[PDB]
Amino acid sequence: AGVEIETISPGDGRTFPKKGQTCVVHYTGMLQNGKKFDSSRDRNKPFKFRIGKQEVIKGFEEGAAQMSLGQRAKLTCTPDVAYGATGHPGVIPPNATLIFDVELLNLE
Amino acid sequence: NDAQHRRIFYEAGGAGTRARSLWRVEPLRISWSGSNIRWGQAFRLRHI
């Protein structure tokens, strides 16, 4: 896959997200140069998305799929699986690799 | 540059405020040249 996962704090290693499940995750996304561009911990609101519906970018969804319950890990989404030639104008420049410090809070 | 500036016209409309329509009446005399102009007196019209 296009995402490289580097563990930070381990989870249970047994409970993984499944189809038709909401993954309540607290994340912090920054550019490859160290410039932060998003963080759900600043807003005090965990981000919820459902696997298999293609709500989020591909790299983020794959990384959360590999992650287990209560696990904090670093996901490196390359431009292939995170925007690419066209990024978020004014936030994410084109052809930018993204790094997310993602914690899988809940599987409900 | 354009030679057409040598021509004189009775152009009307917006030309009564421009500076291309200002003429100076210069009598043919050096002393008392700033005095009243009489009918039939010879002068020169200079374009400012």
Partner: protein
Amino acid sequence: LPIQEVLQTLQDLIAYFQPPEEEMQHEDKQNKLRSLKNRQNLFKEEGMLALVLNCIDRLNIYNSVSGMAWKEILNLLYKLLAALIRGNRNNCAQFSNNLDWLISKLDRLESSSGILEVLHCILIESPEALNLIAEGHIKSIISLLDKHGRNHKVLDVLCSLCLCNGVAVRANQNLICDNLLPR
């Protein structure tokens, strides 16, 4: 060409198109503004703006192929142009046709400040000038920010581009956001 005569003429002309002091009384200030606008109109009608632009072009051509004197002459020419078009909507509308010329001359280090002054005058006064601003011009202004340092007058010009006397121009806003922020 007599350089001293040109310098004295440019200084006298810049002092000729001098706005009244803000401390002046309202009636006197309005009379001075009316006379100044009349003189600006009289000079513009006789093709003095075109003459100033041609003089600037010739000076730039000469410099491309007494350096301090000619630099002062060019700066005085830009100041005179701004004084001619400052606060006069008709003159700024007339100058709107030379946005490409102005922005192309933004790049040079010597001419950047006078060009910025003239451009800000045009944008403030001419309301249609903001309609002629394309992506290339916005990128040129942002590159001026990038190459000359952190000068806040460029940011003032960009703000002027975004909002046009209460009406928002979405194209300018989007261009500025996409080209200035992500980097």
